[PDB]
Design an enzyme around this catalytic site. Structure first.
Site, PDB file in Angstrom:
ATOM      1  N   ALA A 178       0.839  -1.163   0.000  1.00 15.70           N
ATOM      2  CA  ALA A 178       0.000   0.000   0.000  1.00 15.70           C
ATOM      3  C   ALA A 178       0.888   1.231   0.000  1.00 15.70           C
ATOM      4  O   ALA A 178       0.524   2.240   0.565  1.00 15.70           O
ATOM      5  CB  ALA A 178      -0.823  -0.034   1.238  1.00 15.70           C
ATOM      6  N   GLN A 193       8.546   1.622   2.888  1.00 21.68           N
ATOM      7  CA  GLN A 193       9.173   1.632   1.621  1.00 21.68           C
ATOM      8  C   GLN A 193       9.435   3.088   1.349  1.00 21.68           C
ATOM      9  O   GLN A 193       8.495   3.862   1.058  1.00 21.68           O
ATOM     10  CB  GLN A 193       8.254   1.038   0.532  1.00 21.68           C
ATOM     11  CG  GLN A 193       9.003   1.026  -0.807  1.00 21.68           C
ATOM     12  CD  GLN A 193       8.184   0.640  -2.031  1.00 21.68           C
ATOM     13  OE1 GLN A 193       7.026   1.040  -2.193  1.00 21.68           O
ATOM     14  NE2 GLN A 193       8.797  -0.122  -2.904  1.00 21.68           N
ATOM     15  N   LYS A 226      -4.733   6.990  -1.755  1.00 24.10           N
ATOM     16  CA  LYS A 226      -5.639   6.021  -2.360  1.00 24.10           C
ATOM     17  C   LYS A 226      -6.274   5.101  -1.320  1.00 24.10           C
ATOM     18  O   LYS A 226      -7.468   5.196  -1.039  1.00 24.10           O
ATOM     19  CB  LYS A 226      -4.906   5.191  -3.416  1.00 24.10           C
ATOM     20  CG  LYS A 226      -5.778   4.154  -4.105  1.00 24.10           C
ATOM     21  CD  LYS A 226      -5.226   3.791  -5.474  1.00 24.10           C
ATOM     22  CE  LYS A 226      -4.268   2.613  -5.390  1.00 24.10           C
ATOM     23  NZ  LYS A 226      -3.576   2.367  -6.684  1.00 24.10           N
ATOM     24  N   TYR A 228     -30.331  29.227  22.252  1.00 21.59           N
ATOM     25  CA  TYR A 228     -29.091  29.970  22.200  1.00 21.59           C
ATOM     26  C   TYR A 228     -29.345  31.449  22.375  1.00 21.59           C
ATOM     27  O   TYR A 228     -29.951  32.059  21.489  1.00 21.59           O
ATOM     28  CB  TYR A 228     -28.361  29.700  20.884  1.00 21.59           C
ATOM     29  CG  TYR A 228     -27.011  30.354  20.878  1.00 21.59           C
ATOM     30  CD1 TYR A 228     -26.819  31.645  20.290  1.00 21.59           C
ATOM     31  CD2 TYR A 228     -25.921  29.722  21.504  1.00 21.59           C
ATOM     32  CE1 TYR A 228     -25.526  32.272  20.296  1.00 21.59           C
ATOM     33  CE2 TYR A 228     -24.653  30.324  21.521  1.00 21.59           C
ATOM     34  CZ  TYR A 228     -24.451  31.588  20.926  1.00 21.59           C
ATOM     35  OH  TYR A 228     -23.174  32.130  20.982  1.00 21.59           O
ATOM     36  N   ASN A 263      -7.305   1.708  -9.502  1.00 25.91           N
ATOM     37  CA  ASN A 263      -6.287   2.728  -9.717  1.00 25.91           C
ATOM     38  C   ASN A 263      -6.756   4.173  -9.919  1.00 25.91           C
ATOM     39  O   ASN A 263      -5.930   5.073  -9.897  1.00 25.91           O
ATOM     40  CB  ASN A 263      -5.391   2.314 -10.887  1.00 25.91           C
ATOM     41  CG  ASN A 263      -4.694   0.999 -10.642  1.00 25.91           C
ATOM     42  OD1 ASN A 263      -4.469   0.600  -9.497  1.00 25.91           O
ATOM     43  ND2 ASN A 263      -4.314   0.329 -11.711  1.00 25.91           N
ATOM     44  N   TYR A 315     -38.362  23.852  15.040  1.00 27.43           N
ATOM     45  CA  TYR A 315     -36.996  23.482  15.421  1.00 27.43           C
ATOM     46  C   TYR A 315     -36.938  23.097  16.881  1.00 27.43           C
ATOM     47  O   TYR A 315     -37.263  23.884  17.782  1.00 27.43           O
ATOM     48  CB  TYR A 315     -36.063  24.690  15.223  1.00 27.43           C
ATOM     49  CG  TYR A 315     -34.689  24.463  15.844  1.00 27.43           C
ATOM     50  CD1 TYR A 315     -33.749  23.632  15.202  1.00 27.43           C
ATOM     51  CD2 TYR A 315     -34.347  25.016  17.082  1.00 27.43           C
ATOM     52  CE1 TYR A 315     -32.519  23.347  15.774  1.00 27.43           C
ATOM     53  CE2 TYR A 315     -33.056  24.776  17.661  1.00 27.43           C
ATOM     54  CZ  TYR A 315     -32.168  23.943  16.977  1.00 27.43           C
ATOM     55  OH  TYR A 315     -30.928  23.640  17.455  1.00 27.43           O
ATOM     56  N   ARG A 363      -2.992   8.173 -10.378  1.00 24.68           N
ATOM     57  CA  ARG A 363      -4.195   8.230 -11.214  1.00 24.68           C
ATOM     58  C   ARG A 363      -5.525   8.570 -10.438  1.00 24.68           C
ATOM     59  O   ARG A 363      -6.551   8.851 -11.059  1.00 24.68           O
ATOM     60  CB  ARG A 363      -4.306   6.955 -12.103  1.00 24.68           C
ATOM     61  CG  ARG A 363      -3.126   6.724 -13.100  1.00 24.68           C
ATOM     62  CD  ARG A 363      -3.015   5.222 -13.636  1.00 24.68           C
ATOM     63  NE  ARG A 363      -2.912   4.142 -12.614  1.00 24.68           N
ATOM     64  CZ  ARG A 363      -1.850   3.359 -12.389  1.00 24.68           C
ATOM     65  NH1 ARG A 363      -0.720   3.494 -13.087  1.00 24.68           N
ATOM     66  NH2 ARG A 363      -1.888   2.436 -11.440  1.00 24.68           N
ATOM     67  N   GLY A 410      -1.547  -6.687 -15.714  1.00 23.85           N
ATOM     68  CA  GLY A 410      -0.540  -7.609 -16.302  1.00 23.85           C
ATOM     69  C   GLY A 410      -1.263  -8.742 -17.097  1.00 23.85           C
ATOM     70  O   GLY A 410      -2.330  -9.209 -16.666  1.00 23.85           O
TER      71      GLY A 410
END
Ligand SMILES: CC(=O)SCCNC(=O)CCNC(=O)[C@H](O)C(C)(C)COP(=O)(O)OP(=O)(O)OC[C@H]1O[C@@H](n2cnc3c(N)ncnc32)[C@H](O)[C@@H]1OP(=O)(O)O
Ligand SMILES: CC(=O)SCCNC(=O)CCNC(=O)[C@H](O)C(C)(C)COP(=O)(O)OP(=O)(O)OC[C@H]1O[C@@H](n2cnc3c(N)ncnc32)[C@H](O)[C@@H]1OP(=O)(O)O
Ligand SMILES: CC(=O)SCCNC(=O)CCNC(=O)[C@H](O)C(C)(C)COP(=O)(O)OP(=O)(O)OC[C@H]1O[C@@H](n2cnc3c(N)ncnc32)[C@H](O)[C@@H]1OP(=O)(O)O
Ligand SMILES: CC(=O)N[C@H]1[C@@H](OP(=O)(O)OP(=O)(O)OC[C@H]2O[C@@H](n3ccc(=O)[nH]c3=O)[C@H](O)[C@@H]2O)O[C@H](CO)[C@@H](O)[C@@H]1O
Ligand SMILES: CC(=O)N[C@H]1[C@@H](OP(=O)(O)OP(=O)(O)OC[C@H]2O[C@@H](n3ccc(=O)[nH]c3=O)[C@H](O)[C@@H]2O)O[C@H](CO)[C@@H](O)[C@@H]1O
Ligand SMILES: CC(=O)N[C@H]1[C@@H](OP(=O)(O)OP(=O)(O)OC[C@H]2O[C@@H](n3ccc(=O)[nH]c3=O)[C@H](O)[C@@H]2O)O[C@H](CO)[C@@H](O)[C@@H]1O
Ligand SMILES: [Mg+2]
Ligand SMILES: [Mg+2]
Ligand SMILES: [Mg+2]
Ligand SMILES: [Mg+2]
Lengths: 474, 474, 474
Positions: free
Chosen positions: C8, C78, C21, C393, C234, C372, C14, C146
């Site tokens: 990973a 890596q 990713k 409030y 990808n 509300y 891309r 591939g």
């Protein structure tokens, strides 16, 4: 002459529902109702529905449809679901013992089945003098269906059920639609010879094919190219698939008739809905029940309408509504809620965040914003200001309001029913209307504005507001 | 040099519309406009549109596009729809008699046709020195299209129309796209020899192929693999199919550029819409017209935006809006209605059940609930309380409100324009503001609370409320 | 024994995203999280994630999942993306040098990959004593993957990358899934012999196949019929495709379990959502996060729910809500906004244009319109009239309101917190409640109605209203 039997007495296990299968709806009708409309168009002499242990919840819907279709529909009872073959024996019991017409058998779970396919089946059965003609089709995924066994010459030999089929029979992609025409004598005879010796341990109607082949009778299988017409529904995945496909066909019919549907995949149109020429339906819309749309309307996206009549030239956008009518040229939405009993006159307007219930609203009258209209009658060319409420409920009971024509009611008016607002009257912004208002009068109730100077410096110091206010001195 | 003719003079019968076919829209443009954008990218020397009896409603849109595309577009008239061959003769009349460039013919109903396909057509036509090159494609369903007749060597012999084709020709799945390149002399010559002797009884442009083959001229058919680019639109089913396919391509382009689109099937994006990197578009969204979305925005599901500019980091959820702009970091929705002229500053908020029209709303300012803002200018870092209305219409006329910066207006305030609320001012809950409020002042109008004790026992006995209240004594 | 490595650490170019990713979500989980849930079901001895330069944003999510999955997940770094082969060397560094179990390699972008497919991969690899077993599938569009090179006997020879493949290799439609089982020694050995001499200029894990074939080792490719299980992501087009396909499978599972989903294509159901038997989900609905729906509910169309619990028999229509719970039999919607902290009791009602935040609302209590509710506690069987606001409030701070049971508050009441409304109390229409209201009391504040007669003739003459009003005299 022909008798149609509809088998609808199985338990519908794979639906995992407490609602009997047959009664599951697509496009505004139960599957059973779809099957019966189709058959009644064919006008057979006899029509018999075989029901099971839940007959008490289905039999009455059968009577309703008999009454709607203008015909007699009999019910036969199958007290235990011993198989489709056994079911057909039950159905036969509701015919005279000497009945000599053809018998068509069909399922209650083949909801796209149509009168043309059935007429074709009966014509074919007669043309070839078959003892049994079965409808078949061919599917990419044949799982669950009986497989059609044929020799290389295309003669049908047998039908084999998913559960009884060898891995090799299971490769067959031609399947039994469960829709048959029979010579009555041949059928009775073969039903009597059925055996429960098979995986499911039932009396299979499908065995009748191999039985009659063996007897040397004529056996015909008629291939239906349009698979959808004979697709069954055993579980909720198949039900949504056929609802989707039926919906595509309904939408395409309206498109070819002059209705622009921006996104067919997200526009759900019940079977009785009518829509006029040049209307545009934007994505995310459902038109349900007996909804009727005029011509040249815009059906704003994300709209759901059930039994709503919309006149010509109207606009209905982001609206959720039911049992209501919307006059010619009216504008409704975005974000509008119509409850039963809404009648919006021609050129009327119900605007964003407006909810209407059980109210009649005259020609030209506008309720543009943030308002609730309950149990009211409002005349013509009147204007209801923003953020108003027709207070129709006093605690304990329901009360009515009458508003005249050309009225202008101010923003934030509460109409505390019962009250009448005369023609041409106004009501100031912020009014709680508890008494009648004469024509042409101004009704007010809010007290005078009082500006308390320096309140912010003194009660909110040095808030961002106190600072801004101190800067404004300079 | 090349002249492009666009045939758009047919009656469009199968659309069943009072809106001329060519003018039917997908993805923010009329089909005609799509066809003309495509051709203008190619920059041919001449471009001629052949119009029919409704030329008076189309010719002006042609001028608009001529003006947008920065070019000259001529109109030729075909006074009766005698056929595509006749239409091309009309178009030719708008070229000089001695014109010697190539003639490309195309339809006004081939809205995905693109400049690259046309450039390829012209290059091929030239490479093989054809007298006519026709574009073709191959479809699963070839119904309606001319069929491409070819010998086993792939030489084109003729094109045959759906209505004139034998059952056997109808099996052909290679079809005429209706997009041609011609040598001008060859075209004029073959058009002069056309005959109306056929089913539709028209002068078919398609006959020109067989005619020129017979003359011994070179005839080339160029196959377009991407069928969608040459698909026609004769009815509203085909129009929604191509709108859907065009939409997939627009959405995919934005996805490949860094925009996450949760459900492409339900996200409709007009062709001029731009969207920044890392924005997320949730299902059910339409981005229309010239809408522009910044980067890192969230486009809440069920949102429709037409000509809306949304800055970076904004959030726009369940919103319906048009001709508005939404500043950087603003939050809009859910259930919000933006009418033309809305300008929401950076970090602003328009909350649920809020409708804004023609109003400017400063940086940091919040209109969180149940409120209508019409014809107002509101400054920065202000807060508009829930359930408020800018009363911009007195009966008879339009009035303006100005609200300062850092203001806090109380819930249920009616701003009865024209009125100005100074910087840092407050307005109590329930106020009807009829006079200006100085900076830093508190404006109120509601009368004092009055508790009437025992009212419930005395006016609603023994309602559930009277009983609960009696229990509370204990 | 087996170690699973998940690569990973690639840059995810891309995607065109600043969000790594792996961290892109479908169906409520990041792709990485999907991949890790799948592997943890398999319970391998070691599980190692190889991360890259953005490890600091992913490593913590890895720890979160380790903690959820009840296991140890290591991270290997890596530092430059030199290729999938190099990545695997990094991952190996996190195993003991003498590790002797199998090594399964997988990607962090194969989010449908499931424990069964991985168990099958490991069983096959063992059955044939392969040095490497690779998973493959066959796709209509093989672009990007591939290609699997095989001799006519089906022996795998090599894998060739999209970028390195001849036009002829590119015709191959059998592709590498990027999911491998390896004998550890064979893997280490072949990784050491990798060369960066190729188009992308990287160390390809895919070369290991041809290397081990050459060594005379056993090389096995195992074909996965269900392509979706091994599809990669990808770019954002592929991400929406797999989200769509994953969603179909989740929806079908709920359908087969007894949930009617009208339109699966537009119903998005996160992976942890549970839904009871016989509920009906209408189109346009998203059920997200840990949403839980009871049995027999209706999920009105266009509803979005994130972490919402809905009891049995409830109805939730056109609602947007999160972190809330909706009691048995309650009715919510249409057009309702639930913010975090909403607790709606059994048989409660939150109606159209109602927004609730951080409030508890007792059994039987109804907030039907235009209102509300913020920071409130409301008891049982109470009714909150239309167009009301819990003013929570004051400018500057957050304030609480308590409303008793059986209360009836009139339309257009402002509850100016902090305030308590006793049991059985009422509040007249138009009241600004600033003081506590005793049980059984009526609170009012609006002044008396005042009808000013003839105001319209005198202040708006001869408006349409003045004319109508003059007609009413007659
Ligand atoms: C839907 C939308 O968004 S806009 C659409 C619908 N409309 C509205 O809200 C329009 C609202 N406008 C109002 O309430 C205005 O104040 C108007 C039209 C009634 C005031 O008209 P006016 O003629 O300008 O002043 P006017 O002096 O005539 O009214 C006289 C009396 O009623 C009073 N009065 C006027 N408006 C109000 C009010 N909203 N509440 C209480 N009293 C009021 C005065 O205070 C005056 O009484 P007095 O004689 O003690 O002073
Ligand atoms: C959007 C949301 O959901 S919340 C957001 C926006 N906000 C609001 O609604 C905040 C609303 N708050 C109010 O109206 C409050 O009552 C506040 C802030 C004005 C009251 O502030 P206070 O300081 O506590 O009391 P205070 O004693 O100072 O105000 C003084 C005067 O105005 C009065 N007054 C206060 N509020 C109101 C009111 N809402 N209506 C009429 N009169 C009021 C008093 O009765 C007092 O007059 P007096 O001196 O005759 O007694
Ligand atoms: C959600 C929906 O769409 S409907 C649901 C929730 N409901 C509502 O809005 C119900 C609203 N109803 C009201 O406000 C009504 O006027 C009711 C129930 C309070 C009036 O009840 P009543 O008994 O008929 O008259 P009643 O004479 O008893 O009330 C007495 C006092 O308060 C007054 N009063 C009554 N209603 C109001 C009011 N809304 N504002 C100000 N004062 C009021 C009188 O003017 C009277 O005072 P007085 O003795 O000076 O005359
Ligand atoms: C053995 C048999 O016939 N199988 C056929 C049946 O499969 P399938 O498995 O669909 O058969 P079902 O279980 O749906 O039963 C057929 C229909 O007959 C009714 N019913 C069923 C069983 C029973 O004991 N009593 C009863 O009345 C049910 O209402 C049901 O609608 O239809 C398929 C097409 O849809 C065919 O391909 C199969 O060849
Ligand atoms: C005979 C002919 O050409 N048929 C072609 C035409 O079929 P198709 O039946 O689509 O032809 P249309 O009826 O669409 O007419 C072609 C176009 O030319 C214009 N028009 C048409 C008739 C006319 O008399 N005057 C005129 O100007 C129309 O605007 C129309 O857009 O396109 C198909 C592809 O889309 C091709 O496969 C067919 O080979
Ligand atoms: C050379 C190679 O392996 N190609 C395979 C890869 O293509 P593909 O082009 O998809 O390879 P990617 O670029 O997705 O990288 C593979 C995965 O390994 C990680 N990664 C990648 C490069 C790197 O230097 N360091 C690193 O850790 C990335 O997180 C990525 O998720 O998967 C496809 C299926 O999805 C296969 O068909 C291809 O055979
Ligand atoms: Mg069935
Ligand atoms: Mg008042
Ligand atoms: Mg055409
Ligand atoms: Mg990848």
């Amino acid at each position: 002459d022909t008798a149609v039997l509809v088998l609808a007495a199985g338990p519908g296990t794979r639906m995992r529902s407490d609602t009997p299968k047959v009664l599951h709806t697509l496009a505004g009708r139960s599957m059973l109702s779809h099957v019966l409309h189709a058959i009644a168009k064919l006008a057979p002499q006899r029509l018999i529905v075989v029901l099971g242990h839940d007959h008490q919840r289905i039999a009455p819907l059968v009577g309703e449809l008999a009454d709607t279709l203008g015909r007699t529909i009999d019910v036969a009872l199958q007290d235990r679901p011993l198989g489709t073959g056994h079911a057909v024996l039950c159905g036969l019991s509701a015919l005279p013992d000497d009945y000599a017409g053809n018998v068509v058998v069909t399922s209650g779970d083949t909801p796209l089945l149509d009168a043309d396919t059935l007429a074709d089946l009966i014509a074919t059965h007669r043309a070839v003098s078959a003892a049994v003609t079965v409808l078949t089709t061919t599917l990419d995924d044949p799982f669950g269906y009986g497989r059609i066994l044929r020799t290389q010459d295309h003669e049908v030999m047998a039908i084999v059920e998913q559960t009884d089929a060898t891995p090799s029979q299971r490769e067959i992609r031609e399947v039994n639609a469960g829709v048959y025409a029979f010579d009555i004598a041949a059928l009775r005879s073969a039903l009597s010879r059925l055996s429960s010796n098979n995986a499911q341990q039932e009396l299979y109607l499908t065995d009748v094919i191999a039985i009659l082949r063996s007897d040397g009778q004529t056996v015909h299988a008629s291939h239906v190219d349009d698979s959808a017409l004979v697709a069954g529904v055993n579980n909720r995945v198949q039900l949504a698939e056929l609802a989707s496909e039926l919906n595509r066909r309904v939408v395409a019919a309206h498109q070819l008739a002059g209705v622009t549907v921006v996104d067919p995949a997200t526009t759900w149109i019940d079977v009785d809905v009518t829509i006029g020429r040049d209307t545009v339906i934007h994505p995310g819309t459902q038109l349900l029940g007996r909804t009727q749309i005029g011509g040249r309307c815009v059906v704003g996206p994300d709209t759901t309408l059930t039994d709503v009549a919309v006149g010509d030239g109207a606009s209905v956008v982001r609206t959720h509504g039911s049992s209501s009518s919307i006059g010619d040229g009216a504008a409704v939405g975005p974000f509008t809620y119509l409850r039963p009993g809404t009648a919006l006159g021609a050129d009327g307007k119900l605007g964003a965040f407006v909810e209407v219930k059980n109210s009649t609203i005259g020609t030209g009258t506008k309720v543009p914003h943030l308002t609730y209209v309950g149990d009211a009658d409002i005349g013509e060319y009147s204007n209801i200001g923003a953020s108003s409420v027709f207070v129709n409920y006093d605690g304990t009971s329901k009360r009515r309001t009458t508003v005249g024509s050309h009225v202008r009611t101010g923003s934030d008016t509460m109409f505390v029913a019962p009250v009448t607002i005369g023609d041409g009257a106004y009501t100031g912004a912020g009014t709680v209307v508890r008494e009648d208002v004469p024509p042409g009068a101004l009704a007010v109730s809010a007290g005078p504005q009082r500006n308390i100077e320096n309140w912010v410096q003194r009660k909110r110091p040095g808030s961002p507001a106190a600072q801004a206010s101190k800067r404004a001195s300079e």
